[PDB]
Amino acid sequence: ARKFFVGGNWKDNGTAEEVKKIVNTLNEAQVPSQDVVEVVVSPPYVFLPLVKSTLRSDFFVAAQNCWVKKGGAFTGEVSAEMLVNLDIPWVILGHSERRAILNESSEFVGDKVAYALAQGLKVIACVGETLEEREAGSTMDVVAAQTKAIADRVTNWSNVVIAYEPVWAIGTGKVASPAQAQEVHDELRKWLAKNVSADVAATTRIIYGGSVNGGNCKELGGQADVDGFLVGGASLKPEFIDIIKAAE
Amino acid sequence: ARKFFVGGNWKDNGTAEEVKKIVNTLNEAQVPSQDVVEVVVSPPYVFLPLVKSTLRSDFFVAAQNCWVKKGGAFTGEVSAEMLVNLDIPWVILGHSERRAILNESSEFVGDKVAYALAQGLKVIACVGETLEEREAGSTMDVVAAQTKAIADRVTNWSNVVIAYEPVWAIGTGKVASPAQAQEVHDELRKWLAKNVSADVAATTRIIYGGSVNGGNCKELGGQADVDGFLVGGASLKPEFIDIIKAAE
Ligand code: NA
Ligand code: NA
């Protein structure tokens, strides 16, 4: 069985005092065993050492991005080998905000995934379609093309988790049902089975990166092809613990 | 007189052990007084708290970039208000690598400068032309356009330092003379006098961001319109101290 996976993307949020309170609340949390849930939290770069040094050892830390290749003459970027030096085990790559606002192409994201895995990082690789893409009938064309650019560059999927972001439901007045989430996760898994292998399809976690809260987390988590969540704003709040508890 | 200014851009370099050795070497350095040189060092984001907590109090810390506007839903970015929370006083904006490789436009850089200054950061704003631009006769057209996009958005220059990067001499086999540096710095200062004010032209440091080493730092620093340096790779090395000593 695929181990349920809950990632918390803090995005570009936090002060030293807020980070201490978030970490304390996570450290005091009582959640399902390590055997049935894997928990990753993702602070901004400036808080990676602080969170790694203070967070309970059974929760894991992710960076929110990294650079595409070996560091040295890229002002402002953080290399995969720098994250490995700091003992940060995970990285989020291809988040919808970076694809749309910073124009990260599918091939650029795929090159980042390959380089991060080569350096020993575990990767949350994000895919997802816009409302214009969904309304054009292009959901699976887009999600397959994004996934293919990663798959063409990945020789081992053990340390990859795919996150589906329903960008079409993010600030549009459109809402995604559990059935709509399940349909995309099923079709993406079927794509992996045909384009990579049956074994990779069966073993790769595909997590939901839409609106997740205490209200909806059990119905979403219980879908056949949903293996957990990439949480946004609730990741800063005690509600994140209720979302982890969907693994029960 | 304009106070000589030496910035060290570490770029995407460093391990925890290397950072400790760099900071120790800076802490043991014996350099000109605070009255005649201002020293700023710029680690990667993940080392900002470590360097700020351990560096001598008379040297200052810069981030290598920040986001264009208020933080909250920009995965992977670091906001100006986050740097202010961490008591990081400086930021480098518009570095040539970000303009060229990450396609930061002149207007985007100008919006970043304005937002950083509004939040209370001090800014090293970078400009510079490529070899193709220089060979087309476009040096001052390019440098003026880059500067204008910042000037159009800046209402106070007290906390701005401009860095000129001779991108045309960076990995091309072309070399920049002290006379060539002086010519651009003079023409840029003359542009500031006409387009902003005589007072801003007279008081704004314009630092040289080309190849700076112990060999060339005194001849470059002694040019009439060169007010210091934005150092690249030497910033990681004990040679950075020899470059600071050009202020004598
Ligand atoms: Na499920
Ligand atoms: Na000078």
Short mmCIF file of C-alpha atoms and ligand atoms in Angstrom, two decimals:
data_model
loop_
_atom_site.label_atom_id
_atom_site.label_comp_id
_atom_site.label_asym_id
_atom_site.label_seq_id
_atom_site.Cartn_x
_atom_site.Cartn_y
_atom_site.Cartn_z
CA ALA A 1 0.00 0.00 0.00
CA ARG A 2 1.17 3.58 -0.72
CA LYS A 3 2.04 5.43 2.52
CA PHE A 4 -0.19 8.51 2.98
CA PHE A 5 1.85 11.73 2.50
CA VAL A 6 1.10 15.21 3.89
CA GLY A 7 3.28 18.14 2.80
CA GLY A 8 2.91 21.66 4.16
CA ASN A 9 3.98 24.48 1.82
CA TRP A 10 4.43 27.58 4.00
CA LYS A 11 5.18 29.63 0.85
CA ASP A 12 6.83 33.04 1.39
CA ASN A 13 5.50 33.42 4.97
CA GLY A 14 7.08 33.59 8.40
CA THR A 15 8.92 35.54 11.06
CA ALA A 16 11.38 33.99 13.55
CA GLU A 17 8.70 34.26 16.29
CA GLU A 18 5.93 32.71 14.12
CA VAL A 19 8.24 29.87 12.98
CA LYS A 20 9.05 29.03 16.66
CA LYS A 21 5.26 28.85 17.45
CA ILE A 22 4.51 26.70 14.31
CA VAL A 23 7.38 24.30 15.17
CA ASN A 24 6.26 24.09 18.85
CA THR A 25 2.68 23.24 17.74
CA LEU A 26 4.02 20.52 15.35
CA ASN A 27 6.32 19.17 18.12
CA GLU A 28 3.34 18.88 20.53
CA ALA A 29 1.06 17.24 17.88
CA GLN A 30 -0.14 13.66 18.34
CA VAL A 31 -0.69 12.11 14.91
CA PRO A 32 -0.87 8.67 13.27
CA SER A 33 2.22 6.45 13.35
CA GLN A 34 5.23 6.79 10.98
CA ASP A 35 4.02 3.49 9.45
CA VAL A 36 0.88 5.10 7.96
CA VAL A 37 1.77 8.79 7.37
CA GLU A 38 4.84 10.69 6.12
CA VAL A 39 4.84 14.42 7.04
CA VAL A 40 6.97 17.05 5.28
CA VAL A 41 6.95 20.79 6.08
CA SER A 42 8.43 23.43 3.79
CA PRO A 43 9.62 26.76 5.23
CA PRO A 44 11.19 29.62 3.26
CA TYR A 45 14.93 29.22 2.59
CA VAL A 46 15.96 31.61 5.43
CA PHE A 47 14.21 29.34 8.03
CA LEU A 48 15.47 25.94 6.74
CA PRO A 49 18.31 25.61 9.32
CA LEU A 50 16.08 26.85 12.20
CA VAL A 51 13.25 24.40 11.37
CA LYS A 52 15.61 21.45 10.75
CA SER A 53 17.40 22.13 14.10
CA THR A 54 14.15 22.39 16.18
CA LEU A 55 11.50 20.15 14.47
CA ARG A 56 10.67 16.67 15.81
CA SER A 57 12.87 14.07 14.05
CA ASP A 58 9.90 12.06 12.66
CA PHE A 59 8.66 15.06 10.55
CA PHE A 60 10.82 16.04 7.54
CA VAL A 61 11.86 19.37 6.01
CA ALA A 62 11.59 20.52 2.37
CA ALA A 63 12.87 23.52 0.47
CA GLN A 64 10.27 25.26 -1.73
CA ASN A 65 12.58 25.30 -4.81
CA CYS A 66 16.21 24.76 -5.87
CA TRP A 67 18.43 25.59 -8.82
CA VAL A 68 18.57 23.53 -12.07
CA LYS A 69 22.30 22.62 -12.00
CA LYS A 70 25.59 22.85 -10.06
CA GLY A 71 25.90 26.11 -8.09
CA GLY A 72 28.59 28.76 -8.53
CA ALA A 73 27.63 31.83 -10.64
CA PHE A 74 23.86 32.16 -10.08
CA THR A 75 23.18 35.09 -7.78
CA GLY A 76 20.06 34.59 -5.59
CA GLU A 77 19.65 30.81 -6.16
CA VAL A 78 20.02 27.87 -3.75
CA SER A 79 21.62 24.70 -5.17
CA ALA A 80 20.50 21.13 -4.49
CA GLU A 81 23.99 20.37 -3.08
CA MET A 82 23.54 23.31 -0.58
CA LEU A 83 20.28 21.70 0.66
CA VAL A 84 22.06 18.33 1.00
CA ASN A 85 24.88 20.06 3.05
CA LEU A 86 22.18 21.46 5.43
CA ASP A 87 20.60 17.95 5.76
CA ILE A 88 17.32 19.12 4.13
CA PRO A 89 15.93 15.91 2.61
CA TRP A 90 13.04 17.18 0.37
CA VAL A 91 12.38 19.86 -2.26
CA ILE A 92 9.17 21.10 -3.93
CA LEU A 93 9.67 21.62 -7.68
CA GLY A 94 7.38 23.05 -10.39
CA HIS A 95 4.84 24.65 -8.03
CA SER A 96 2.05 26.33 -10.02
CA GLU A 97 3.12 29.82 -8.78
CA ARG A 98 6.65 29.27 -10.21
CA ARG A 99 5.34 27.84 -13.52
CA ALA A 100 2.88 30.78 -13.98
CA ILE A 101 4.47 33.87 -12.29
CA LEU A 102 8.23 33.02 -12.81
CA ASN A 103 7.64 31.25 -16.14
CA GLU A 104 9.32 27.93 -15.22
CA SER A 105 8.78 25.75 -18.32
CA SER A 106 7.92 22.03 -18.10
CA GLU A 107 11.44 21.15 -19.39
CA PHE A 108 13.11 23.48 -16.83
CA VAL A 109 11.10 21.81 -14.02
CA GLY A 110 12.06 18.38 -15.39
CA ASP A 111 15.75 19.34 -15.43
CA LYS A 112 15.43 20.54 -11.80
CA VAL A 113 13.79 17.24 -10.73
CA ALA A 114 16.54 15.19 -12.39
CA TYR A 115 19.32 17.30 -10.81
CA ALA A 116 17.73 17.26 -7.30
CA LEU A 117 17.28 13.44 -7.42
CA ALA A 118 20.90 13.03 -8.69
CA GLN A 119 22.13 15.00 -5.63
CA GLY A 120 20.09 12.73 -3.26
CA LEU A 121 17.04 14.96 -2.58
CA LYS A 122 13.51 13.58 -2.48
CA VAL A 123 11.14 15.61 -4.71
CA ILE A 124 7.53 16.78 -4.58
CA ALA A 125 7.00 17.41 -8.34
CA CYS A 126 3.95 19.62 -9.02
CA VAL A 127 1.66 19.62 -12.10
CA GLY A 128 -1.73 21.22 -12.79
CA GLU A 129 -3.95 23.01 -15.35
CA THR A 130 -5.42 26.54 -15.41
CA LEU A 131 -9.16 27.34 -15.75
CA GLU A 132 -8.62 28.31 -19.43
CA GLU A 133 -6.89 24.92 -20.03
CA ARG A 134 -9.65 22.99 -18.18
CA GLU A 135 -12.47 24.83 -20.05
CA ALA A 136 -10.70 24.12 -23.42
CA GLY A 137 -10.87 20.33 -22.64
CA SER A 138 -7.08 20.22 -22.12
CA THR A 139 -6.78 18.98 -18.45
CA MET A 140 -5.10 15.66 -19.20
CA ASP A 141 -3.19 17.00 -22.24
CA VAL A 142 -1.60 19.62 -19.91
CA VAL A 143 -1.03 17.32 -16.90
CA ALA A 144 0.41 14.57 -19.17
CA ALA A 145 2.76 17.03 -20.93
CA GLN A 146 4.02 18.43 -17.60
CA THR A 147 4.48 14.88 -16.23
CA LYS A 148 6.16 13.65 -19.45
CA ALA A 149 8.83 16.40 -19.26
CA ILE A 150 9.71 15.01 -15.77
CA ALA A 151 9.37 11.31 -16.75
CA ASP A 152 11.66 11.79 -19.81
CA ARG A 153 14.39 12.94 -17.33
CA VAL A 154 13.80 10.54 -14.37
CA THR A 155 15.32 7.05 -14.26
CA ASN A 156 14.16 6.20 -10.68
CA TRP A 157 10.77 7.22 -9.13
CA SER A 158 11.37 5.85 -5.56
CA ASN A 159 12.04 9.37 -4.19
CA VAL A 160 9.35 11.24 -6.20
CA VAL A 161 5.88 12.29 -5.03
CA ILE A 162 3.63 13.95 -7.65
CA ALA A 163 1.33 16.78 -6.51
CA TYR A 164 -1.73 17.69 -8.65
CA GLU A 165 -2.71 21.37 -8.21
CA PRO A 166 -6.22 22.24 -9.55
CA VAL A 167 -5.04 25.76 -10.51
CA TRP A 168 -8.50 26.20 -12.20
CA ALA A 169 -10.15 26.17 -8.70
CA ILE A 170 -7.60 28.58 -7.06
CA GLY A 171 -9.14 32.13 -6.87
CA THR A 172 -11.69 31.61 -9.78
CA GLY A 173 -15.01 30.98 -7.91
CA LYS A 174 -14.79 27.40 -9.24
CA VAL A 175 -14.65 24.62 -6.66
CA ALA A 176 -13.20 21.12 -7.10
CA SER A 177 -15.22 18.12 -5.81
CA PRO A 178 -13.56 14.97 -4.42
CA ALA A 179 -14.83 13.19 -7.60
CA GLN A 180 -13.03 15.77 -9.83
CA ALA A 181 -9.78 15.30 -7.85
CA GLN A 182 -10.11 11.49 -8.08
CA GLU A 183 -10.72 11.66 -11.86
CA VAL A 184 -7.43 13.52 -12.49
CA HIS A 185 -5.41 11.38 -10.06
CA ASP A 186 -6.79 8.18 -11.68
CA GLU A 187 -6.04 9.40 -15.24
CA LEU A 188 -2.52 10.55 -14.21
CA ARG A 189 -1.78 7.16 -12.57
CA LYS A 190 -3.06 5.38 -15.71
CA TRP A 191 -0.70 7.61 -17.78
CA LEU A 192 2.23 6.60 -15.51
CA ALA A 193 1.35 2.89 -15.92
CA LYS A 194 1.47 3.15 -19.75
CA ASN A 195 4.39 5.62 -20.13
CA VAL A 196 6.68 4.48 -17.28
CA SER A 197 5.55 1.12 -15.80
CA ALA A 198 2.77 -0.62 -13.88
CA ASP A 199 5.10 -0.80 -10.84
CA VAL A 200 5.84 2.97 -10.85
CA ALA A 201 2.10 3.70 -11.21
CA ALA A 202 1.24 1.40 -8.27
CA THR A 203 3.93 2.73 -5.89
CA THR A 204 4.17 6.49 -6.63
CA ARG A 205 2.20 8.77 -4.27
CA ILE A 206 -0.01 11.28 -6.09
CA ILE A 207 -1.06 13.96 -3.59
CA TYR A 208 -3.80 16.57 -3.94
CA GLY A 209 -2.66 20.23 -3.92
CA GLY A 210 -6.06 21.96 -4.02
CA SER A 211 -8.07 23.44 -1.10
CA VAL A 212 -7.52 21.10 1.84
CA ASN A 213 -9.00 21.76 5.29
CA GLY A 214 -10.36 19.75 8.29
CA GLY A 215 -13.82 19.68 6.59
CA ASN A 216 -12.78 17.92 3.35
CA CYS A 217 -9.55 16.02 4.20
CA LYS A 218 -11.11 12.62 5.05
CA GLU A 219 -13.33 12.48 1.91
CA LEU A 220 -10.40 13.53 -0.33
CA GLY A 221 -7.87 11.19 1.41
CA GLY A 222 -10.24 8.21 1.03
CA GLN A 223 -10.33 8.54 -2.79
CA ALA A 224 -8.72 5.50 -4.47
CA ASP A 225 -5.98 7.46 -6.31
CA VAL A 226 -5.41 10.32 -3.75
CA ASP A 227 -2.43 9.50 -1.51
CA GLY A 228 -2.35 12.67 0.61
CA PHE A 229 -2.03 16.42 0.29
CA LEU A 230 0.20 19.39 -0.52
CA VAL A 231 -1.34 21.93 1.87
CA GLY A 232 -1.03 25.72 1.38
CA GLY A 233 -2.15 28.28 4.04
CA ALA A 234 -3.47 25.74 6.58
CA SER A 235 0.21 24.50 6.81
CA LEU A 236 0.95 27.56 9.01
CA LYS A 237 -1.94 26.74 11.41
CA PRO A 238 -2.88 24.08 13.98
CA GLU A 239 -5.41 22.86 11.34
CA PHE A 240 -2.44 21.24 9.54
CA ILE A 241 -2.54 18.59 12.32
CA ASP A 242 -6.21 17.76 11.53
CA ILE A 243 -5.13 17.26 7.86
CA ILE A 244 -2.30 14.85 8.92
CA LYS A 245 -4.96 12.94 10.94
CA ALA A 246 -6.84 12.13 7.67
CA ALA A 247 -4.25 9.29 7.42
CA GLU A 248 -6.15 7.42 10.25
CA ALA B 1 33.05 62.87 0.03
CA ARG B 2 31.35 59.57 -0.93
CA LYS B 3 32.27 56.78 1.53
CA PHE B 4 34.08 53.92 -0.25
CA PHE B 5 31.84 50.81 -0.44
CA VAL B 6 32.91 47.16 -0.79
CA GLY B 7 30.23 44.49 -1.28
CA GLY B 8 30.97 40.77 -1.47
CA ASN B 9 28.52 38.68 -3.52
CA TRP B 10 29.08 35.05 -2.48
CA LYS B 11 26.53 33.95 -5.11
CA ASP B 12 25.15 30.40 -4.78
CA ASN B 13 28.20 29.11 -2.85
CA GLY B 14 28.79 27.80 0.65
CA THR B 15 28.57 24.99 3.17
CA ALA B 16 28.06 25.51 6.93
CA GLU B 17 31.78 24.70 7.49
CA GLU B 18 33.00 27.06 4.71
CA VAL B 19 30.72 29.89 5.95
CA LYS B 20 32.18 29.53 9.51
CA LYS B 21 35.76 29.82 8.07
CA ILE B 22 34.83 32.85 5.84
CA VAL B 23 33.16 34.62 8.81
CA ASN B 24 36.15 33.84 11.10
CA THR B 25 38.57 35.31 8.50
CA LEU B 26 36.39 38.47 8.18
CA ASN B 27 36.15 38.74 12.01
CA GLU B 28 39.98 38.58 12.32
CA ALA B 29 40.53 41.12 9.47
CA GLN B 30 42.12 44.51 10.21
CA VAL B 31 40.80 47.04 7.69
CA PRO B 32 40.35 50.81 7.32
CA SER B 33 38.05 52.62 9.75
CA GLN B 34 34.22 52.71 9.49
CA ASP B 35 34.67 56.41 8.59
CA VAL B 36 36.28 55.60 5.22
CA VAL B 37 34.88 52.18 4.17
CA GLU B 38 31.47 50.46 4.35
CA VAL B 39 31.65 46.64 3.97
CA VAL B 40 28.67 44.46 3.01
CA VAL B 41 28.79 40.67 2.53
CA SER B 42 26.04 38.69 0.80
CA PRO B 43 25.56 34.99 1.60
CA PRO B 44 22.91 32.70 0.10
CA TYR B 45 19.47 32.93 1.78
CA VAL B 46 19.99 29.74 3.86
CA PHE B 47 23.09 31.30 5.57
CA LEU B 48 21.64 34.79 6.27
CA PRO B 49 20.76 34.09 9.96
CA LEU B 50 24.09 32.27 10.59
CA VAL B 51 26.19 35.10 9.09
CA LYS B 52 24.17 37.87 10.78
CA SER B 53 24.49 36.09 14.18
CA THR B 54 28.31 35.53 13.91
CA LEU B 55 29.75 38.40 11.77
CA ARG B 56 31.50 41.40 13.37
CA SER B 57 28.94 44.18 13.99
CA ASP B 58 30.80 46.77 11.85
CA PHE B 59 30.38 44.65 8.63
CA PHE B 60 26.83 44.41 7.21
CA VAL B 61 24.81 41.59 5.62
CA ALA B 62 22.91 41.59 2.30
CA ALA B 63 20.52 39.17 0.66
CA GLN B 64 21.29 38.40 -3.01
CA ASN B 65 17.66 39.06 -4.13
CA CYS B 66 14.12 39.55 -2.78
CA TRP B 67 10.57 39.42 -4.09
CA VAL B 68 8.84 42.32 -5.92
CA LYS B 69 5.88 42.82 -3.53
CA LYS B 70 4.22 41.73 -0.26
CA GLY B 71 4.76 38.02 0.49
CA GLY B 72 2.05 35.38 0.86
CA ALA B 73 1.39 33.17 -2.20
CA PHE B 74 4.78 33.04 -3.97
CA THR B 75 6.36 29.63 -3.41
CA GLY B 76 10.19 29.75 -3.30
CA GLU B 77 10.56 33.56 -2.87
CA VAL B 78 11.87 35.61 0.08
CA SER B 79 10.04 38.90 0.79
CA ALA B 80 11.68 42.20 1.75
CA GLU B 81 9.65 42.19 5.01
CA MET B 82 11.15 38.70 5.84
CA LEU B 83 14.68 40.17 5.46
CA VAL B 84 13.70 43.12 7.71
CA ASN B 85 12.36 40.60 10.36
CA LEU B 86 15.79 38.82 10.30
CA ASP B 87 17.59 42.21 10.70
CA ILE B 88 19.29 41.87 7.27
CA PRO B 89 19.89 45.50 6.25
CA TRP B 90 20.91 45.22 2.53
CA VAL B 91 19.75 43.50 -0.66
CA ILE B 92 21.35 43.11 -4.11
CA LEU B 93 18.80 43.66 -6.90
CA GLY B 94 19.06 43.30 -10.70
CA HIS B 95 22.32 41.33 -10.75
CA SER B 96 23.37 40.57 -14.34
CA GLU B 97 22.85 36.78 -13.80
CA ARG B 98 19.19 37.40 -12.79
CA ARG B 99 18.56 39.86 -15.68
CA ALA B 100 20.07 37.42 -18.26
CA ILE B 101 19.41 33.83 -16.97
CA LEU B 102 16.09 34.45 -15.03
CA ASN B 103 14.89 37.17 -17.43
CA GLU B 104 14.32 39.90 -14.81
CA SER B 105 13.25 42.93 -16.88
CA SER B 106 14.42 46.49 -16.09
CA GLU B 107 10.87 47.38 -14.89
CA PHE B 108 10.71 44.26 -12.65
CA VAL B 109 14.09 45.21 -11.09
CA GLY B 110 12.84 48.79 -10.62
CA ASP B 111 9.68 47.54 -8.88
CA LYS B 112 11.85 45.37 -6.58
CA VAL B 113 14.10 48.34 -5.70
CA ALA B 114 11.11 50.53 -4.86
CA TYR B 115 9.49 47.81 -2.70
CA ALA B 116 12.76 46.97 -0.84
CA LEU B 117 13.41 50.67 -0.07
CA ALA B 118 9.76 51.10 1.08
CA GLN B 119 10.26 48.22 3.57
CA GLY B 120 13.47 49.88 4.94
CA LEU B 121 16.17 47.83 3.11
CA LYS B 122 19.27 49.43 1.64
CA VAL B 123 19.79 48.38 -2.01
CA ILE B 124 22.74 47.56 -4.26
CA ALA B 125 21.03 48.11 -7.66
CA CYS B 126 22.96 46.48 -10.54
CA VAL B 127 23.14 47.60 -14.20
CA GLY B 128 25.42 46.59 -17.10
CA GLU B 129 25.66 45.84 -20.85
CA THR B 130 26.52 42.64 -22.75
CA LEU B 131 29.34 42.31 -25.32
CA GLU B 132 26.76 42.43 -28.17
CA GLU B 133 25.31 45.67 -26.68
CA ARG B 134 28.80 47.22 -26.22
CA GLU B 135 29.92 46.27 -29.77
CA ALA B 136 26.65 47.77 -31.20
CA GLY B 137 27.57 51.16 -29.58
CA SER B 138 24.74 50.77 -27.03
CA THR B 139 26.65 50.85 -23.65
CA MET B 140 25.15 54.06 -22.32
CA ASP B 141 21.75 53.51 -24.03
CA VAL B 142 21.49 50.19 -22.09
CA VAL B 143 22.90 51.44 -18.76
CA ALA B 144 20.71 54.59 -18.91
CA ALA B 145 17.57 52.55 -19.70
CA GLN B 146 18.25 50.13 -16.82
CA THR B 147 18.95 53.06 -14.46
CA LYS B 148 15.89 55.02 -15.67
CA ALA B 149 13.53 52.11 -14.84
CA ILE B 150 14.88 52.32 -11.24
CA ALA B 151 14.95 56.17 -11.09
CA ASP B 152 11.32 56.39 -12.34
CA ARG B 153 10.34 54.32 -9.24
CA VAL B 154 12.69 55.79 -6.56
CA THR B 155 11.81 58.94 -4.60
CA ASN B 156 14.85 58.81 -2.22
CA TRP B 157 18.41 57.69 -3.20
CA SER B 158 20.03 57.89 0.32
CA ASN B 159 19.91 54.08 0.73
CA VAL B 160 20.85 53.14 -2.88
CA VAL B 161 24.26 52.12 -4.21
CA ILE B 162 24.51 51.51 -7.99
CA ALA B 163 26.79 48.70 -9.21
CA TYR B 164 28.04 48.73 -12.84
CA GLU B 165 28.76 45.19 -14.13
CA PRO B 166 30.83 45.08 -17.37
CA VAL B 167 29.00 41.90 -18.50
CA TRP B 168 30.88 42.30 -21.87
CA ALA B 169 34.19 41.45 -20.05
CA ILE B 170 32.77 38.44 -18.07
CA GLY B 171 33.83 35.16 -19.82
CA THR B 172 34.36 36.73 -23.35
CA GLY B 173 38.20 37.09 -23.55
CA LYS B 174 37.61 40.87 -23.42
CA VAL B 175 39.18 42.74 -20.52
CA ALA B 176 38.07 46.07 -19.03
CA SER B 177 40.73 48.73 -18.26
CA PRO B 178 40.42 51.17 -15.33
CA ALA B 179 39.86 53.91 -17.99
CA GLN B 180 36.90 51.94 -19.49
CA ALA B 181 35.35 51.51 -16.00
CA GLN B 182 35.85 55.24 -15.24
CA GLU B 183 34.23 56.24 -18.57
CA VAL B 184 30.99 54.35 -17.78
CA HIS B 185 30.88 55.49 -14.13
CA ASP B 186 31.41 59.14 -15.22
CA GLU B 187 28.70 58.96 -17.93
CA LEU B 188 26.25 57.24 -15.51
CA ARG B 189 26.88 59.91 -12.83
CA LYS B 190 26.34 62.65 -15.47
CA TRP B 191 23.04 60.91 -16.41
CA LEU B 192 21.98 60.94 -12.72
CA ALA B 193 22.81 64.67 -12.44
CA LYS B 194 20.56 65.53 -15.43
CA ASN B 195 17.72 63.02 -14.83
CA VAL B 196 17.51 63.07 -11.00
CA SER B 197 19.58 65.94 -9.49
CA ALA B 198 23.10 67.28 -9.04
CA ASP B 199 22.88 66.35 -5.32
CA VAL B 200 21.92 62.69 -6.03
CA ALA B 201 24.74 62.44 -8.60
CA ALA B 202 27.30 63.86 -6.12
CA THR B 203 26.28 61.64 -3.16
CA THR B 204 25.32 58.26 -4.71
CA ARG B 205 28.05 55.58 -4.64
CA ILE B 206 28.64 53.93 -8.02
CA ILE B 207 30.64 50.74 -7.45
CA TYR B 208 32.47 48.61 -10.01
CA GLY B 209 31.21 45.01 -10.43
CA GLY B 210 33.81 43.71 -12.91
CA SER B 211 36.95 41.63 -12.19
CA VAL B 212 38.34 42.95 -8.91
CA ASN B 213 41.43 41.45 -7.24
CA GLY B 214 44.40 42.60 -5.08
CA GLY B 215 46.33 43.48 -8.30
CA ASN B 216 43.82 46.02 -9.73
CA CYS B 217 41.80 47.27 -6.71
CA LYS B 218 43.87 50.41 -5.93
CA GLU B 219 43.98 51.66 -9.56
CA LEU B 220 40.22 51.05 -9.98
CA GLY B 221 39.31 52.53 -6.54
CA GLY B 222 41.33 55.70 -7.27
CA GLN B 223 39.25 56.51 -10.39
CA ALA B 224 37.26 59.75 -9.90
CA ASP B 225 33.79 58.17 -10.39
CA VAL B 226 34.48 54.65 -8.92
CA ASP B 227 33.35 54.49 -5.28
CA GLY B 228 34.16 50.86 -4.52
CA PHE B 229 33.38 47.34 -5.69
CA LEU B 230 30.81 44.56 -5.95
CA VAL B 231 33.18 41.58 -5.69
CA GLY B 232 32.31 38.08 -7.01
CA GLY B 233 34.48 34.98 -6.32
CA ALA B 234 37.21 36.77 -4.33
CA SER B 235 34.41 37.55 -1.75
CA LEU B 236 34.75 33.92 -0.51
CA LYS B 237 38.54 34.26 -0.01
CA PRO B 238 40.99 36.12 2.24
CA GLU B 239 41.73 38.29 -0.87
CA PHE B 240 38.42 40.09 -0.14
CA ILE B 241 40.30 41.80 2.75
CA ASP B 242 42.96 43.16 0.33
CA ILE B 243 40.07 44.61 -1.77
CA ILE B 244 38.55 46.34 1.33
CA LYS B 245 42.05 47.80 1.98
CA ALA B 246 41.85 49.71 -1.37
CA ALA B 247 39.83 52.25 0.71
CA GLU B 248 43.15 53.37 2.40
NA NA C 1 -6.57 7.46 -0.83
NA NA C 2 37.33 56.62 -6.45
#
